[PDB]
Nucleic acid binder design. Structure first.
Ligand SMILES: [Mg+2]
Ligand SMILES: [Mg+2]
Ligand SMILES: [Mg+2]
Ligand SMILES: [Mg+2]
Ligand SMILES: [Mg+2]
Ligand SMILES: [Mg+2]
Ligand SMILES: [Mg+2]
Ligand SMILES: [Mg+2]
Ligand SMILES: [Mg+2]
Ligand SMILES: [Mg+2]
Ligand SMILES: [Mg+2]
Ligand SMILES: [Mg+2]
Ligand SMILES: [Mg+2]
Ligand SMILES: [Mg+2]
Ligand SMILES: [Mg+2]
Ligand SMILES: [Mg+2]
Ligand SMILES: [Mg+2]
Ligand SMILES: [Mg+2]
Ligand SMILES: [Mg+2]
Ligand SMILES: [Mg+2]
Ligand SMILES: [Mg+2]
Ligand SMILES: [Mg+2]
Ligand SMILES: [Mg+2]
Ligand SMILES: [Mg+2]
Ligand SMILES: [Mg+2]
Ligand SMILES: [Mg+2]
Ligand SMILES: [Mg+2]
Ligand SMILES: [Mg+2]
Ligand SMILES: [Mg+2]
Ligand SMILES: [Mg+2]
Ligand SMILES: [Mg+2]
Ligand SMILES: [Mg+2]
Ligand SMILES: [Mg+2]
Ligand SMILES: [Mg+2]
Ligand SMILES: [Mg+2]
Ligand SMILES: [Mg+2]
Ligand SMILES: [Mg+2]
Ligand SMILES: [Mg+2]
Ligand SMILES: [Mg+2]
Ligand SMILES: [Mg+2]
Ligand SMILES: [Mg+2]
Ligand SMILES: [Mg+2]
Ligand SMILES: [Mg+2]
Ligand SMILES: [Mg+2]
Ligand SMILES: [Mg+2]
Ligand SMILES: [Mg+2]
Ligand SMILES: [Mg+2]
Ligand SMILES: [Mg+2]
Ligand SMILES: [Mg+2]
Ligand SMILES: [Mg+2]
Ligand SMILES: [Mg+2]
Ligand SMILES: [Mg+2]
Ligand SMILES: [Mg+2]
Ligand SMILES: [Mg+2]
Ligand SMILES: [Mg+2]
Ligand SMILES: [Mg+2]
Ligand SMILES: [Mg+2]
Ligand SMILES: [Mg+2]
Ligand SMILES: [Mg+2]
Ligand SMILES: [Mg+2]
Ligand SMILES: [Mg+2]
Ligand SMILES: [Mg+2]
Ligand SMILES: [Mg+2]
Ligand SMILES: [Mg+2]
Ligand SMILES: [Mg+2]
Ligand SMILES: [Mg+2]
Ligand SMILES: [Mg+2]
Ligand SMILES: [Mg+2]
Ligand SMILES: [Mg+2]
Ligand SMILES: [Mg+2]
Ligand SMILES: [Mg+2]
Ligand SMILES: [Mg+2]
Ligand SMILES: [Mg+2]
Ligand SMILES: [Mg+2]
Ligand SMILES: [Mg+2]
Ligand SMILES: [Mg+2]
Ligand SMILES: [Mg+2]
Ligand SMILES: [Mg+2]
Ligand SMILES: [Mg+2]
Ligand SMILES: [Mg+2]
Ligand SMILES: [Mg+2]
Ligand SMILES: [Mg+2]
Ligand SMILES: [Mg+2]
Ligand SMILES: [Mg+2]
Ligand SMILES: [Mg+2]
Ligand SMILES: [Mg+2]
Ligand SMILES: [Mg+2]
Ligand SMILES: [Mg+2]
Ligand SMILES: [Mg+2]
Ligand SMILES: [Mg+2]
Ligand SMILES: [Mg+2]
Ligand SMILES: [Mg+2]
Ligand SMILES: [Mg+2]
Ligand SMILES: [Mg+2]
Ligand SMILES: [Mg+2]
Ligand SMILES: [Mg+2]
Ligand SMILES: [Mg+2]
Ligand SMILES: [Mg+2]
Ligand SMILES: [Mg+2]
Ligand SMILES: [Mg+2]
Ligand SMILES: [Mg+2]
Ligand SMILES: [Mg+2]
Ligand SMILES: [Mg+2]
Ligand SMILES: [Mg+2]
Ligand SMILES: [Mg+2]
Ligand SMILES: [Mg+2]
Ligand SMILES: [Mg+2]
Ligand SMILES: [Mg+2]
Ligand SMILES: [Mg+2]
Ligand SMILES: [Mg+2]
Ligand SMILES: [Mg+2]
Ligand SMILES: [Mg+2]
Ligand SMILES: [Mg+2]
Ligand SMILES: [Mg+2]
Ligand SMILES: [Mg+2]
Ligand SMILES: [Mg+2]
Ligand SMILES: [Mg+2]
Ligand SMILES: [Mg+2]
Ligand SMILES: [Mg+2]
Ligand SMILES: [Mg+2]
Ligand SMILES: [Mg+2]
Ligand SMILES: [Mg+2]
Ligand SMILES: [Mg+2]
Ligand SMILES: [Mg+2]
Ligand SMILES: [Mg+2]
Ligand SMILES: [Mg+2]
Ligand SMILES: [Mg+2]
Ligand SMILES: [Mg+2]
Ligand SMILES: [Mg+2]
Ligand SMILES: [Mg+2]
Ligand SMILES: [Mg+2]
Ligand SMILES: [Mg+2]
Ligand SMILES: [Mg+2]
Ligand SMILES: [Mg+2]
Ligand SMILES: [Mg+2]
Ligand SMILES: [Mg+2]
Ligand SMILES: [Mg+2]
Ligand SMILES: [Mg+2]
Ligand SMILES: [Mg+2]
Ligand SMILES: [Mg+2]
Ligand SMILES: [Mg+2]
Ligand SMILES: [Mg+2]
Ligand SMILES: [Mg+2]
Ligand SMILES: [Mg+2]
Ligand SMILES: [Mg+2]
Ligand SMILES: [Mg+2]
Ligand SMILES: [Mg+2]
Ligand SMILES: [Mg+2]
Ligand SMILES: [Mg+2]
Ligand SMILES: [Mg+2]
Ligand SMILES: [Mg+2]
Ligand SMILES: [Mg+2]
Ligand SMILES: [Mg+2]
Ligand SMILES: [Mg+2]
Ligand SMILES: [Mg+2]
Ligand SMILES: [Mg+2]
Ligand SMILES: [Mg+2]
Ligand SMILES: [Mg+2]
Ligand SMILES: [Mg+2]
Ligand SMILES: [Mg+2]
Ligand SMILES: [Mg+2]
Ligand SMILES: [Mg+2]
Ligand SMILES: [Mg+2]
Ligand SMILES: [Mg+2]
Ligand SMILES: [Mg+2]
Ligand SMILES: [Mg+2]
Ligand SMILES: [Mg+2]
Ligand SMILES: [Mg+2]
Ligand SMILES: [Mg+2]
Ligand SMILES: [Mg+2]
Ligand SMILES: [Mg+2]
Ligand SMILES: [Mg+2]
Ligand SMILES: [Mg+2]
Ligand SMILES: [Mg+2]
Ligand SMILES: [Mg+2]
Ligand SMILES: [Mg+2]
Ligand SMILES: [Mg+2]
Ligand SMILES: [Mg+2]
Ligand SMILES: [Mg+2]
Ligand SMILES: [Mg+2]
Ligand SMILES: [Mg+2]
Ligand SMILES: [Mg+2]
Ligand SMILES: [Mg+2]
Ligand SMILES: [Mg+2]
Ligand SMILES: [Mg+2]
Ligand SMILES: [Mg+2]
Ligand SMILES: [Mg+2]
Ligand SMILES: [Mg+2]
Ligand SMILES: [Mg+2]
Ligand SMILES: [Mg+2]
Ligand SMILES: [Mg+2]
Ligand SMILES: [Mg+2]
Ligand SMILES: [Mg+2]
Ligand SMILES: [Mg+2]
Ligand SMILES: [Mg+2]
Ligand SMILES: [Mg+2]
Ligand SMILES: [Mg+2]
Ligand SMILES: [Mg+2]
Ligand SMILES: [Mg+2]
Ligand SMILES: [Mg+2]
Ligand SMILES: [Mg+2]
Ligand SMILES: [Mg+2]
Ligand SMILES: [Mg+2]
Ligand SMILES: [Mg+2]
Ligand SMILES: [Mg+2]
Ligand SMILES: [Mg+2]
Ligand SMILES: [Mg+2]
Ligand SMILES: [Mg+2]
Ligand SMILES: [Mg+2]
Ligand SMILES: [Mg+2]
Ligand SMILES: [Mg+2]
Ligand SMILES: [Mg+2]
Ligand SMILES: [Mg+2]
Ligand SMILES: [Mg+2]
Ligand SMILES: [Mg+2]
Ligand SMILES: [Mg+2]
Ligand SMILES: [Mg+2]
Ligand SMILES: [Mg+2]
Ligand SMILES: [Mg+2]
Ligand SMILES: [Mg+2]
Ligand SMILES: [Mg+2]
Ligand SMILES: [Mg+2]
Ligand SMILES: [Mg+2]
Ligand SMILES: [Mg+2]
Lengths: 88, 275
RNA sequence: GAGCUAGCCCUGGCCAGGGUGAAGCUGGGGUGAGACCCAGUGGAGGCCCGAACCGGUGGGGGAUGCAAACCCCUCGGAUGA
RNA sequence: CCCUCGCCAAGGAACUCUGCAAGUUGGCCCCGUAACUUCGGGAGAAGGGGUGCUCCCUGGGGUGAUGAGCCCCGGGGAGCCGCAGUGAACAGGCUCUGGCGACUGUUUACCAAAAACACAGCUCUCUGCGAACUCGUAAGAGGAGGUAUAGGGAGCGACGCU
RNA sequence: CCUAAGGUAGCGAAAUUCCUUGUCGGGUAAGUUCCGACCUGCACGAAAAGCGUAACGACCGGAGCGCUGUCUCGGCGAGGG
RNA sequence: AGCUAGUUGGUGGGGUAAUGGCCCACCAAGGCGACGACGGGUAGCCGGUCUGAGAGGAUGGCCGGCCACAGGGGCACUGA
RNA sequence: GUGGGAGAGGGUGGUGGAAUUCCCGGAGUAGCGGUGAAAUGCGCAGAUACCGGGAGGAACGCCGAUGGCGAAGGCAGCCACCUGGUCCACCCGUGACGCUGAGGCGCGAAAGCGUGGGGAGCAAACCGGAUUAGAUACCCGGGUAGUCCACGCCCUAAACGAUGCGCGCUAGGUCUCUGGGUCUCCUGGGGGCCGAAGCUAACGCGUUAAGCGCGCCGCCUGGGGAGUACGGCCGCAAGG
RNA sequence: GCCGAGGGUAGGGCCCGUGACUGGGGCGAAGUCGUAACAAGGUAGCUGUACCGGAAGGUGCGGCUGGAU
């Protein structure tokens, strides 16, 4: 799995203010994290169709926030997806 | 893998070629090659004694190590994996820490840069050689000797494997590539693993010319000949066989057994093959 | 008797010029990543047209011949078994 | 009269076993191109336009030096002549529709080139290796310095559905 | 009644159909050939493979356009005899 | 289910009472489409008429308005 | 976010025993098998029944449940790794970021197809024996695809709860699974039964609505012809 | 001299009428054969698919209850 420690760094490098967990920024960043791992899991386990739905939900989930974030502060949108390397 | 071609010529449409991905060295090791005397299928009398042979690509013969009990306890690194025109299987260049270089036929799974060793003490891992008695019952093995120190004779073609079944005194029990069940002496060396290049059989030659490159001339059917030439010869128009299908020499060719019955190795074959 | 002819073995040599444009690769697009689509590059093939060279489809001539199998026109293959 | 060749009013295959033979078409450039299809093809499908020469204007490239010159690949305009401009020579006639063989190949040197042989591909069958099988009285060889994803024998003959 | 068992799919007047120029349809002014059908298949039929199949063929059929001394139907001319 | 070479726009001219690719030359790579382009089918449109509780449905002969045509097409001349 | 939970949810790799079959050694004799009764079949060339050895494949008994999980198809020995959904408590973070969803994309039981393996049991086709008027069946003896594995296709169903998703509101009793509490019981989330009001043509539904309401989607418009034809797209074919 | 009604050559697209023969469909009916479904319909039914059979159908595999007891 992802570990507690491994996850905090993500929470820590994306937080808007000192105490932050779960702002759009952190939210996307946390999601980008599980996504990219599942992607690599399915790369090997091509027959794990059930967990692909998970992936498609997460990919769907992150997508809807990015639209929110891109709507409110465009300057901030392009900032997060650069640090995360996301568009395609 | 196997590489297909787009149908840009009529013959390309079906032709498939080997993938050659496991190859890391495109040149044979000079001090281990020697010239192949092509025979054309003709013997020292000059007579064709195996019909329809000749005119294939020139080949340099790679000297292979079918002994390996030659160097017990001296390990070697896998330096490369090479193409050998004289077999279905691929070959592995070993650099012994001894400094000496040898070829063996390449097992499946072998890695460029790994190490292998032969002897009573070798770990049971891919590429090692041991007398059959020290390989655990049930593990699959290749390059098996038939009598001790006589050389590896069995399981040498691409993708093949023999498997150890059980033991009985001085002898172990092998299931050969053909499914036959045989006793082989326990001092017969063998190499753990199966032979590589298993995708070999899925190769579609593709056109007459490919066979020609392989040194295989066209085969002419008996039915297309005359009675002087062949049992199936002659007749006006096409004709059925009109007798039990026979070879050019007259023996029965559909079903008839030919192994010598009183052959001494009979005491050692448990079950004749299958399928 | 294989200095003709047939097959094979060893070692050399030869195939004007033009055309078509496979994979691959690079860039662009696409997607979660892909599959894939497009462009350029590329130069594959018992691929195409056609000399040499190897043949011998049709027709005509020849028929005590130029010739005990030739001549003319035409036609098949021409990187390949 | 014969051979080899040239032309021909009107007709245009009515010739004949058969358009046999001979006309036609013919190179390059541009436009354009159907059924069907294994998506490659079918395709040079078909069909049509252009083609010489003179003058004026201009574009890219090679060797120079970045320029002159020399050489290569073009674009645009206006004009001249003849029956006719790949003006001579070399250089496809086309289409529709069945049979047979999938295809390139091979064959009766010297009456048959094919629907015949071969062919990739499919199946049956033999062979545990001093293999089977083949040649040889034998020795010795081929098989194979190969080892059942390998080797022999036989039938069928891409591929699809069987 | 008989057999070891009684020809399945597909195809069929066929490189196979004797009677035969079978019958009907198409094409032609007129078609013993050709194409499409029918089926009492003299005597198809499933690896001596069955029914199809794009591409290919100096293979063998049938038709049309183009164009012609092939023909009506022959004429003149050249050169070697 | 994709359509488009006068095609979509620019410039310069031609043309008319007058705008305009209406027409020509040059230049740019554009214009239209599921809010249905393109294509096929059908119909001249309206005031109104008919029916219907209304909403709606059906319709456009007579009469009034507009359009289009004058054997089938093309073209101009005279002329406000 | 933090901290916890239950589960045949999914993928990979291993591994355990029961049983069937075949082979081998033993010992043993005249029958075994099967049905309604029989025959086919197997058996003195030594079967069945019994003991020991071995080979191989498929499916997991008890637990097991009116249970659990998944969006659906579906998922059951056990072990490890990789991975998804989901509930709970705290009320810590973001601040309407939501709902639905024409096209699109993916998943999708069985059978079926392609290439290669594997093949113990079972078993379309097929053979034989019975039954019968006939028996191209039902019953019995045999038996090939297939059923299993890998990769790639097909995309259908009584693919069902014959019930699209989300949200809010409208009595309760009881049984069960799974979190949390102040552990009588209270509170959440799933799985059944009976029932308030109401709905319904009736049957029945009823806080898991088929009730009272809003949003968006898909769908219906007499039976047959017909899920056919033609066109179109998809597929190797079957065919969708 | 350009454009130009249209005439002519060549190849394509949609539609309509028609065709030896052929595929099933509707109706007719007083015909032949069997009895598949409705009762446990005398082998519970239906189902997608696959193979087979004169015909309804049968059987395999999986599914549903819209199955008596
Ligand atoms: Mg999520
Ligand atoms: Mg975005
Ligand atoms: Mg490989
Ligand atoms: Mg290929
Ligand atoms: Mg290729
Ligand atoms: Mg390819
Ligand atoms: Mg080709
Ligand atoms: Mg081909
Ligand atoms: Mg190979
Ligand atoms: Mg190869
Ligand atoms: Mg390789
Ligand atoms: Mg040397
Ligand atoms: Mg040698
Ligand atoms: Mg010698
Ligand atoms: Mg000699
Ligand atoms: Mg031989
Ligand atoms: Mg030979
Ligand atoms: Mg090799
Ligand atoms: Mg092959
Ligand atoms: Mg060779
Ligand atoms: Mg061969
Ligand atoms: Mg042959
Ligand atoms: Mg022959
Ligand atoms: Mg002969
Ligand atoms: Mg002889
Ligand atoms: Mg003789
Ligand atoms: Mg003989
Ligand atoms: Mg014979
Ligand atoms: Mg003869
Ligand atoms: Mg013969
Ligand atoms: Mg004869
Ligand atoms: Mg013969
Ligand atoms: Mg004959
Ligand atoms: Mg013959
Ligand atoms: Mg024949
Ligand atoms: Mg004969
Ligand atoms: Mg025969
Ligand atoms: Mg004979
Ligand atoms: Mg005979
Ligand atoms: Mg031996
Ligand atoms: Mg010679
Ligand atoms: Mg010679
Ligand atoms: Mg040489
Ligand atoms: Mg050449
Ligand atoms: Mg060339
Ligand atoms: Mg060249
Ligand atoms: Mg490269
Ligand atoms: Mg790329
Ligand atoms: Mg390219
Ligand atoms: Mg080029
Ligand atoms: Mg080339
Ligand atoms: Mg060639
Ligand atoms: Mg060529
Ligand atoms: Mg060529
Ligand atoms: Mg020369
Ligand atoms: Mg010569
Ligand atoms: Mg020759
Ligand atoms: Mg000749
Ligand atoms: Mg000629
Ligand atoms: Mg002659
Ligand atoms: Mg001649
Ligand atoms: Mg002569
Ligand atoms: Mg000549
Ligand atoms: Mg020529
Ligand atoms: Mg030539
Ligand atoms: Mg050529
Ligand atoms: Mg060539
Ligand atoms: Mg070469
Ligand atoms: Mg060669
Ligand atoms: Mg004339
Ligand atoms: Mg004339
Ligand atoms: Mg004519
Ligand atoms: Mg004419
Ligand atoms: Mg005549
Ligand atoms: Mg003719
Ligand atoms: Mg001719
Ligand atoms: Mg000519
Ligand atoms: Mg010419
Ligand atoms: Mg010519
Ligand atoms: Mg056509
Ligand atoms: Mg095409
Ligand atoms: Mg054709
Ligand atoms: Mg042309
Ligand atoms: Mg054609
Ligand atoms: Mg031309
Ligand atoms: Mg001139
Ligand atoms: Mg130079
Ligand atoms: Mg210069
Ligand atoms: Mg020309
Ligand atoms: Mg001239
Ligand atoms: Mg000349
Ligand atoms: Mg000339
Ligand atoms: Mg030519
Ligand atoms: Mg001609
Ligand atoms: Mg044609
Ligand atoms: Mg022809
Ligand atoms: Mg014929
Ligand atoms: Mg044929
Ligand atoms: Mg032939
Ligand atoms: Mg041929
Ligand atoms: Mg074929
Ligand atoms: Mg051939
Ligand atoms: Mg050739
Ligand atoms: Mg050719
Ligand atoms: Mg040829
Ligand atoms: Mg040929
Ligand atoms: Mg001769
Ligand atoms: Mg000859
Ligand atoms: Mg001779
Ligand atoms: Mg002779
Ligand atoms: Mg001769
Ligand atoms: Mg001759
Ligand atoms: Mg000949
Ligand atoms: Mg020829
Ligand atoms: Mg000849
Ligand atoms: Mg031949
Ligand atoms: Mg042949
Ligand atoms: Mg075949
Ligand atoms: Mg095969
Ligand atoms: Mg002999
Ligand atoms: Mg002898
Ligand atoms: Mg010897
Ligand atoms: Mg030897
Ligand atoms: Mg040797
Ligand atoms: Mg060998
Ligand atoms: Mg062939
Ligand atoms: Mg042949
Ligand atoms: Mg043959
Ligand atoms: Mg086909
Ligand atoms: Mg019998
Ligand atoms: Mg007939
Ligand atoms: Mg006839
Ligand atoms: Mg026929
Ligand atoms: Mg035919
Ligand atoms: Mg016949
Ligand atoms: Mg006849
Ligand atoms: Mg006759
Ligand atoms: Mg008559
Ligand atoms: Mg007649
Ligand atoms: Mg007629
Ligand atoms: Mg005629
Ligand atoms: Mg007639
Ligand atoms: Mg007639
Ligand atoms: Mg004829
Ligand atoms: Mg004839
Ligand atoms: Mg016919
Ligand atoms: Mg008849
Ligand atoms: Mg025959
Ligand atoms: Mg034969
Ligand atoms: Mg036969
Ligand atoms: Mg044949
Ligand atoms: Mg045929
Ligand atoms: Mg054929
Ligand atoms: Mg054909
Ligand atoms: Mg040919
Ligand atoms: Mg030919
Ligand atoms: Mg003509
Ligand atoms: Mg004359
Ligand atoms: Mg004269
Ligand atoms: Mg003259
Ligand atoms: Mg004269
Ligand atoms: Mg004269
Ligand atoms: Mg305009
Ligand atoms: Mg213009
Ligand atoms: Mg109209
Ligand atoms: Mg009208
Ligand atoms: Mg009303
Ligand atoms: Mg109206
Ligand atoms: Mg009216
Ligand atoms: Mg009026
Ligand atoms: Mg008018
Ligand atoms: Mg009138
Ligand atoms: Mg008029
Ligand atoms: Mg008018
Ligand atoms: Mg006036
Ligand atoms: Mg026993
Ligand atoms: Mg006895
Ligand atoms: Mg036992
Ligand atoms: Mg659930
Ligand atoms: Mg708060
Ligand atoms: Mg959708
Ligand atoms: Mg499925
Ligand atoms: Mg399945
Ligand atoms: Mg099948
Ligand atoms: Mg299969
Ligand atoms: Mg298989
Ligand atoms: Mg029976
Ligand atoms: Mg019976
Ligand atoms: Mg029966
Ligand atoms: Mg049974
Ligand atoms: Mg099969
Ligand atoms: Mg299956
Ligand atoms: Mg259900
Ligand atoms: Mg449900
Ligand atoms: Mg439904
Ligand atoms: Mg219903
Ligand atoms: Mg919905
Ligand atoms: Mg609703
Ligand atoms: Mg509780
Ligand atoms: Mg608790
Ligand atoms: Mg509850
Ligand atoms: Mg439950
Ligand atoms: Mg209730
Ligand atoms: Mg009530
Ligand atoms: Mg309740
Ligand atoms: Mg209702
Ligand atoms: Mg009606
Ligand atoms: Mg209806
Ligand atoms: Mg359908
Ligand atoms: Mg259906
Ligand atoms: Mg259709
Ligand atoms: Mg015009
Ligand atoms: Mg016109
Ligand atoms: Mg006119
Ligand atoms: Mg009709
Ligand atoms: Mg009809
Ligand atoms: Mg009818
Ligand atoms: Mg009944
Ligand atoms: Mg029943
Ligand atoms: Mg029934
Ligand atoms: Mg069924
Ligand atoms: Mg019958
Ligand atoms: Mg049955
Ligand atoms: Mg279900």
């Amino acid at each position: 799995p992802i570990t507690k420690e491994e996850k905090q760094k993500v929470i820590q490098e994306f937080a808007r203010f000192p105490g932050d967990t779960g702002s759009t920024e952190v939210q996307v960043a946390l999601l980008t994290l599980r996504i990219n791992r599942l992607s690599e899991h399915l790369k090997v386990h091509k027959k794990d169709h059930h967990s692909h739905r998970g992936l498609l939900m997460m990919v769907g989930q992150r997508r809807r926030l990015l639209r929110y974030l891109q709507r409110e502060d465009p300057e901030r949108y392009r900032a997060l997806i650069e640090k995360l390397g996301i568009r395609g | 893998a196997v590489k297909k071609f787009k149908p840009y010529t009529p013959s390309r449409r079906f032709m498939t070629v080997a993938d050659f991905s496991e190859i890391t060295k495109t040149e044979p090791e000079k001090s281990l090659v020697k010239p192949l005397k092509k025979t054309g299928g003709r013997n020292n009398q000059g007579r064709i004694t195996v019909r329809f042979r000749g005119g294939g690509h020139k080949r340099l013969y790679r000297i292979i190590d079918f002994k390996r009990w030659d160097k017990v306890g001296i390990p070697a690194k896998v330096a490369a994996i090479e193409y050998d025109p004289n077999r279905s299987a691929r070959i592995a260049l070993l650099h012994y820490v001894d400094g000496e270089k040898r070829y063996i036929i390449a097992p499946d799974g072998l890695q460029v840069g790994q190490q292998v060793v032969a002897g009573p003490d070798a770990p049971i891992q891919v590429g090692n050689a041991l007398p059959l008695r020290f390989i655990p019952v049930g593990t699959v093995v290749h390059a098996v000797e038939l009598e001790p120190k006589k050389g590896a004779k069995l399981a040498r073609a691409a993708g093949t494997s023999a498997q150890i079944q059980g033991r009985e005194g001085d002898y172990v029990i092998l299931r050969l590539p053909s499914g036959e069940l045989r006793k082989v002496h326990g001092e017969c060396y063998a190499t753990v693993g199966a032979v590589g290049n298993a995708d070999h059989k899925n190769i579609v030659l593709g056109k007459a010319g490919r066979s020609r490159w392989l040194g295989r001339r066209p085969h002419v059917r008996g039915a297309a000949m005359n009675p002087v030439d062949h049992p199936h010869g002659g007749g006006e128009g096409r004709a059925p066989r009109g007798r039990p299908p026979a070879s050019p020499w007259g023996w029965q060719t559909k079903g008839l057994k030919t192994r010598k019955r009183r052959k001494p190795s009979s005491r050692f074959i448990i079950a004749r093959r299958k399928k």
